[PDB]
Amino acid sequence: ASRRRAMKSATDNADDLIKALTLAANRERQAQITQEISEIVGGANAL
Amino acid sequence: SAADIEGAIEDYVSSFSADTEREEIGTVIDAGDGIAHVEGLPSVMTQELLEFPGGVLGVALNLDEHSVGAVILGEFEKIEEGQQVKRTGEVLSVPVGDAFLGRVVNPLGQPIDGQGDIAAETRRALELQAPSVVQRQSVSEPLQTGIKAIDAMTPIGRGQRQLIIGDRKTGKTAVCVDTILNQREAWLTGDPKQQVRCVYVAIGQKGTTIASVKRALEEGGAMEYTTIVAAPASDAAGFKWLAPYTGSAIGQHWMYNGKHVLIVFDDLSKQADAYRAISLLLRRPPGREAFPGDVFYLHSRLLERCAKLSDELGGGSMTGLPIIETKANDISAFIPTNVISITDGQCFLESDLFNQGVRPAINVGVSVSRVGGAAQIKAMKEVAGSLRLDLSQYRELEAFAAFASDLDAASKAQLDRGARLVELLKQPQYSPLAVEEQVVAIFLGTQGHLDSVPVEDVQRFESELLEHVKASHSDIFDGIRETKKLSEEAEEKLVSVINEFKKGFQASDGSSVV
Amino acid sequence: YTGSAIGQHWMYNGKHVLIVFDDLSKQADAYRAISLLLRRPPGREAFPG
Amino acid sequence: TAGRVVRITGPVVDVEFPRGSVPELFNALHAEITFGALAKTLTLEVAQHLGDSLVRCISMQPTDGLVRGVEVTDTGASISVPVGDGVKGHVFNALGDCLDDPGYGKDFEHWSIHRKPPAFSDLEPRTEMLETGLKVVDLLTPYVRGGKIALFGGAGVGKTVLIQEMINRIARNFGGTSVFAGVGERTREGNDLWVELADANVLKDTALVFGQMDEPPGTRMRVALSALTMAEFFRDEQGQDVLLFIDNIFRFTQAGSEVSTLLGRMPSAVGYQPTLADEMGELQERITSTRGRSITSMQAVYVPADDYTDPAPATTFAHLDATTELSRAVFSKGIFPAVDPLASSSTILDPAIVGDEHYRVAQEVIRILQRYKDLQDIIAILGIDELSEEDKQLVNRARRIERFLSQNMMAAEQFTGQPGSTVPLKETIEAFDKLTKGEFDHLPEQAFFLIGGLDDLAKKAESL
Amino acid sequence: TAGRVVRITGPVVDVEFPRGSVPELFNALHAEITFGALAKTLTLEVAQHLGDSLVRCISMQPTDGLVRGVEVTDTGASISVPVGDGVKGHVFNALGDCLDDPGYGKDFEHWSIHRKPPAFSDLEPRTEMLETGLKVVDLLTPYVRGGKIALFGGAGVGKTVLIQEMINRIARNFGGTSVFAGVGERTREGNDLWVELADANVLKDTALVFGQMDEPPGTRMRVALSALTMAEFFRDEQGQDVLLFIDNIFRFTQAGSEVSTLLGRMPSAVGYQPTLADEMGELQERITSTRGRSITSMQAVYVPADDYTDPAPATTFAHLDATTELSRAVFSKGIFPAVDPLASSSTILDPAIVGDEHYRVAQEVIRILQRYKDLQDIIAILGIDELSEEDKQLVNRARRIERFLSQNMMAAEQFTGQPGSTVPLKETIEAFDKLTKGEFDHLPEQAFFLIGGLDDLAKKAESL
Numbered sequence A: 001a002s003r004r005r006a007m008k009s010a011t012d013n014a015d016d017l018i019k020a021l022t023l024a025a026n027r028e029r030q031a032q033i034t035q036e037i038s039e040i041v042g043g044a045n046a047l
Numbered sequence B: 001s002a003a004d005i006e007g008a009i010e011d012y013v014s015s016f017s018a019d020t021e022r023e024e025i026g027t028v029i030d031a032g033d034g035i036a037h038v039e040g041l042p043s044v045m046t047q048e049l050l051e052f053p054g055g056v057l058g059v060a061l062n063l064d065e066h067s068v069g070a071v072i073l074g075e076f077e078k079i080e081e082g083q084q085v086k087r088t089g090e091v092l093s094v095p096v097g098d099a100f101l102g103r104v105v106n107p108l109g110q111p112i113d114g115q116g117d118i119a120a121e122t123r124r125a126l127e128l129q130a131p132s133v134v135q136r137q138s139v140s141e142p143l144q145t146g147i148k149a150i151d152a153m154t155p156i157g158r159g160q161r162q163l164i165i166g167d168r169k170t171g172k173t174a175v176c177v178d179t180i181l182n183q184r185e186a187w188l189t190g191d192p193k194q195q196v197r198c199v200y201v202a203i204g205q206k207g208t209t210i211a212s213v214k215r216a217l218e219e220g221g222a223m224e225y226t227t228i229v230a231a232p233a234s235d236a237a238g239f240k241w242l243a244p245y246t247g248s249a250i251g252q253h254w255m256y257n258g259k260h261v262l263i264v265f266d267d268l269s270k271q272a273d274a275y276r277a278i279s280l281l282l283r284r285p286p287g288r289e290a291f292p293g294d295v296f297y298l299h300s301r302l303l304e305r306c307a308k309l310s311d312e313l314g315g316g317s318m319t320g321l322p323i324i325e326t327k328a329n330d331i332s333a334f335i336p337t338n339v340i341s342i343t344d345g346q347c348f349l350e351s352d353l354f355n356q357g358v359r360p361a362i363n364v365g366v367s368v369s370r371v372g373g374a375a376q377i378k379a380m381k382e383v384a385g386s387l388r389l390d391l392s393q394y395r396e397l398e399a400f401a402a403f404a405s406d407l408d409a410a411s412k413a414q415l416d417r418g419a420r421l422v423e424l425l426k427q428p429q430y431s432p433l434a435v436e437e438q439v440v441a442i443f444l445g446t447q448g449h450l451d452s453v454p455v456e457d458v459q460r461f462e463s464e465l466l467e468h469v470k471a472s473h474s475d476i477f478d479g480i481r482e483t484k485k486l487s488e489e490a491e492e493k494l495v496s497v498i499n500e501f502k503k504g505f506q507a508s509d510g511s512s513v514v
Numbered sequence C: 001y002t003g004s005a006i007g008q009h010w011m012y013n014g015k016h017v018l019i020v021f022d023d024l025s026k027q028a029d030a031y032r033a034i035s036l037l038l039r040r041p042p043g044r045e046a047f048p049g
Numbered sequence D, E: 001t002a003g004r005v006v007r008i009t010g011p012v013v014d015v016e017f018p019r020g021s022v023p024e025l026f027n028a029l030h031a032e033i034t035f036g037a038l039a040k041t042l043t044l045e046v047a048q049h050l051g052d053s054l055v056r057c058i059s060m061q062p063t064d065g066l067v068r069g070v071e072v073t074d075t076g077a078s079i080s081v082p083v084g085d086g087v088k089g090h091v092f093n094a095l096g097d098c099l100d101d102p103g104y105g106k107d108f109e110h111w112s113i114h115r116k117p118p119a120f121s122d123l124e125p126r127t128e129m130l131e132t133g134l135k136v137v138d139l140l141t142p143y144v145r146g147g148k149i150a151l152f153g154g155a156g157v158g159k160t161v162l163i164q165e166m167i168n169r170i171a172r173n174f175g176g177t178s179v180f181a182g183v184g185e186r187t188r189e190g191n192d193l194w195v196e197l198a199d200a201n202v203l204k205d206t207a208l209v210f211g212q213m214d215e216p217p218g219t220r221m222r223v224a225l226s227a228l229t230m231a232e233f234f235r236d237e238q239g240q241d242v243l244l245f246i247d248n249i250f251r252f253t254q255a256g257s258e259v260s261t262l263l264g265r266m267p268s269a270v271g272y273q274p275t276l277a278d279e280m281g282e283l284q285e286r287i288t289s290t291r292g293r294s295i296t297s298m299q300a301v302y303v304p305a306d307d308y309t310d311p312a313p314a315t316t317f318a319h320l321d322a323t324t325e326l327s328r329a330v331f332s333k334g335i336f337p338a339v340d341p342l343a344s345s346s347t348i349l350d351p352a353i354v355g356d357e358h359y360r361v362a363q364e365v366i367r368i369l370q371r372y373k374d375l376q377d378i379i380a381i382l383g384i385d386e387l388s389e390e391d392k393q394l395v396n397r398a399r400r401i402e403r404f405l406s407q408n409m410m411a412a413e414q415f416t417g418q419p420g421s422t423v424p425l426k427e428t429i430e431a432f433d434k435l436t437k438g439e440f441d442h443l444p445e446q447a448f449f450l451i452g453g454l455d456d457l458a459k460k461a462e463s464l
Ligand SMILES: Nc1ncnc2c1ncn2[C@@H]1O[C@H](COP(=O)(O)OP(=O)(O)OP(=O)(O)O)[C@@H](O)[C@H]1O
Pocket: B167, B168, B169, B170, B171, B172, B173, B174, B175, B325, B359, B360, B427, B428, B429, E346, E347, E349, E350
């Protein structure tokens, strides 16, 4: 019974950690896109 | 040998006449990195084919009030300031005809395989309209790729646009070469309603890789109905940009003439890279990942030529199999997102599955085909109906592989069935399976005849069983092929032969399978 | 560069030198500032090529 | 007076006009491509004024073959689309040209696709539920009259059948019409939709406006506005409730992004156009209820990278009032219309807009379905017999509830013959109140498949 | 009719010529720097024609000391390098000037560094295995004789050590001619290679061309072409099998990027030049082998930021038959040669070429390693004790396989102290078949570390 409870808690924590890491990875994905575009258009504006 | 060695030249000298036609001239004022700016040419039209003094060709791509920025199609180093540029009054066009079968041609239609010239039936502009909504027809005819995974899970119907998308060295070119090879049986029939003509467009591949693909097609007998529009990495960015359009035009000529075409773009990522290079060199504004605003259009304008025409236009079809290399399995990148939006379905190939031995490595589940069962023959539709659900249940149950004693009987049966289905979808390279053999193979697994064979032997049990059926009980294959459905009497005969074979099958572990 | 030149003068006279650049990340930042003030178009991370 | 093309950089075309005749923004100009193979009449949409009497335009058609110095004639009005009863039953492009019957509608009343949204004093201050007649929609995720509904789904989940169902219900129950704004259509999918609607005989109640993918981004960006202008004409002039489908409004956003890039505007956060929110607002704010008539819209939305925080879906969802999510799992269980009761949502499922009884019944159904979804893992791995008696009772009740959420759609009448059912909202509420209380747990599960209301439930039970 | 320097910006120099004497692209121009400390003859390469009789050039030597208005004389031909059997046994720079003996080849035949790749008609695939003696390479990434081989890696993961080891394993016994192009690598390792080759008497059969990173972008661009010209002469004009080692081919694209913005090109993604793919494709295609004329090229490729998704390595991948891929993750775990067995690949690893036994063993090793990589996440948190018995056995197998892929290479004696070892391909296949099948599960895993062979495995196990 304690293993059931502990593994349910572990699964819930893993799901919450997956959600947090997915939100993060989305933030760095958007930030990488932005930064790449900033570099590209900074080179463009100077040339 | 013959007198022709002289006669041909005679025919030229007697027929040659350079007449004096008026011509508009520009002068090259800038030249660098594959782009030449040409002052003058007042009447030049966008995407025209300019000819430079050294036999070089360019495409008038940017038109301003000052200059015409043209992308040079090879031999760029021979362009200099002050050179005279003559305009050919023709937008980008390529020759097209049945003479392109078995030939390797650069994006301008000129042979590069070293054989004779190509007798062109006609010329087609690369930028002609795609078939309109009113001119198309529902995709309803299968295009058997020969890969059990694709033909069962994500069927490709001729007229469809299926994207083979995945990271490097995952099995994409293998899938498309297998698809091209699988059409030999259709070609040998001689029926245009069955024949599929192939156009393997290589963009950005090295010359030896294109040679390897050509060898794989020749040793497979596929070169007598396949053309290879090759833009090797040595070629200018213009050729890498144009090659898909060249191949699409060569295919479209057949498509509007009632034939069925199969176009493989390998890859469209390099097409996009070449277009990005041209755009940035012409100073077109950049966007995400520096691609120009119309890069999506570049791919869309291409893939939408791949259509099935209505019966009023001959009923021909052109099937697209664009190949995209996804970096680090990032299907959310710009070009992958664009082409996933454009295409009708996606075979996602994953390196993890490839290393697990799931090669041809289609990630079923994530992989989809929006045409669906309409692209399958009735036999495969009925046999492979339960396959997707079984594989999904297996992937759900995989975490329980170590506790099969503690699972429900139904769950353990599902796990055992799924492992054998996964082994069943595996397939050796350059060995496509006819649709009847695929039907029988998937019938083995979905109907439970593999449930007694050990997992590690499934690949063999299938391979031998078909080898038996073909040789001894071909009536099953003939029935499936001629009628397109697995009849009840044929099904009973197939079950009887499977059971008879089971007795004579030696499992690798030494156990008996009955 | 000044430290390297001072060290190189000794190096070419047959003497052993130990140069410590603390830190080269700040030289890169200084070069980035100089390049952007001269209006050289930058590369990745706004650094010059 | 007529302009001259002075620059051609892909879709972007610059036109120099005489000083006194520069067209105002968004005017449609016509240029002629006389090259035989590519002969065309380009429709250029004025996007900027560059000065010295130059205007930068986004070509609505491929500019291949266009020549510098070619005469450009100003129409004097922005992209205009035909509007009227005549647009019903026909397919149009973003520019109002009929695709299935060329030259059709060129003599109709034409409306500019750039129209301001309703005056602030003309908006409806109170959200009104749209009783569409489907049990699942009306109970779990009630639609909003004059609101926007996201339609998540894909292939083989009955999205097209649901579109047909809603076309039938808006045409028959509300006496309205539909306009299908195919932004970024796959020409194959567009042709399939055209033939499906013609076969279902609902084409006469819908006007199709396809901006295909093969066209440059200008048309893909303006097709939503064109279809919405037809819907606006139906709402304001004909006085009909309208149902504007937009498959897929991410495309519209991405076409805007591509147009922005082409014109040279610096990209926003994730590469989207700086005016993303304003374009999306200018599109969505026109979809609203005015003077008693409403344009409802089911807008399929693509979520890039499955990231709902992305600028495009984040801007789209600021306007979406409901969210219907079609599920493959539910579809495989025979439960058409294939709506997932748990993934789908609505912003009107509140005790205030809907009755308190409605909210209570919907929340009870959601609770039961969620508990069943949790027990699915145990059922699949451990078997049904490993549950408790209370769990088994709840599983039976949840099976029956989720099967009763299915319905005999009008779109299915063409296949089976059984007329589609329009279950009144009160009847659905009381029926699901009975279901959740166990009053029908003794009927076989097959009795609840594809039946509208308690009368049909009783008749089917007696037929089994 | 000499030119005149107008504009100097780092390595890029603009030169104005008289109207009738503008040099062709890729021509070599000679300016002169007269400042005493930096006096030299400066070789520029015409990179762009910019109009108004101006050309823009990439300087090969540093422009420090160059003065505006200085006369620039045109050579009338591209940069030419010496070719012939004379080059063997000597060290040259990008310009063809001998370093170990100044003025040595000035009278040899001179070839332009710029020439078109061999025609597609003359290319055939190569499918002959090259046994290096390295277990991991021979097993999982078999090299192709006459094919294209690469050693990808991050920064400081052992690319130079491994390429030196490959020079030791392939060239020492090679009967043909070797060419080593040090393209923007470290000068210390270049001198180390020079002395190593001199001591082993391989120098007499090796031509070294160095453009090391102390040099400006021009040399780091053109040195690869200068060495490839010698390789092409040996391939075409003599028909000798040729080895072509390059270290590091990424520096070519990086130098192109360095001069990209000074040439006026708008930067592409990650700040690379727009012409990345074409520029690298020309050079890579010149390296192929034509039928009857073999070049066995090995190219150390540098992966910026350890990111294999970077445009440069990603574009280079398409040009290679075998691609060993060193990773910092494996290097951290102490495994030398530091190969990632999963990321690395080879086109000759088919059952039809390497045989069914080799293919089966390699694919089983890759399967075990992939399963181990998938399990490493579980093991680090839930512990090994919670894995399945089969998975636990597989993990024990995989650790030993990873450590057995490590090998004491001859070039890494100064990394480990112990001498190098050579493992026959048959012994590698047998040993890995035994591992994957279990015959060594009883031996400690540390017995498999840096041993190279079954006899060494037994000896180290006994020593443990
Ligand atoms: N079904 C298969 N069974 C076994 N090996 C396969 C299979 N498919 C592909 N391979 C092998 O996998 C490797 C990659 O194949 P392929 O050349 O088709 O890859 P690709 O995805 O096109 O990648 P690249 O970017 O290198 O072109 C080759 O060794 C090929 O032989």
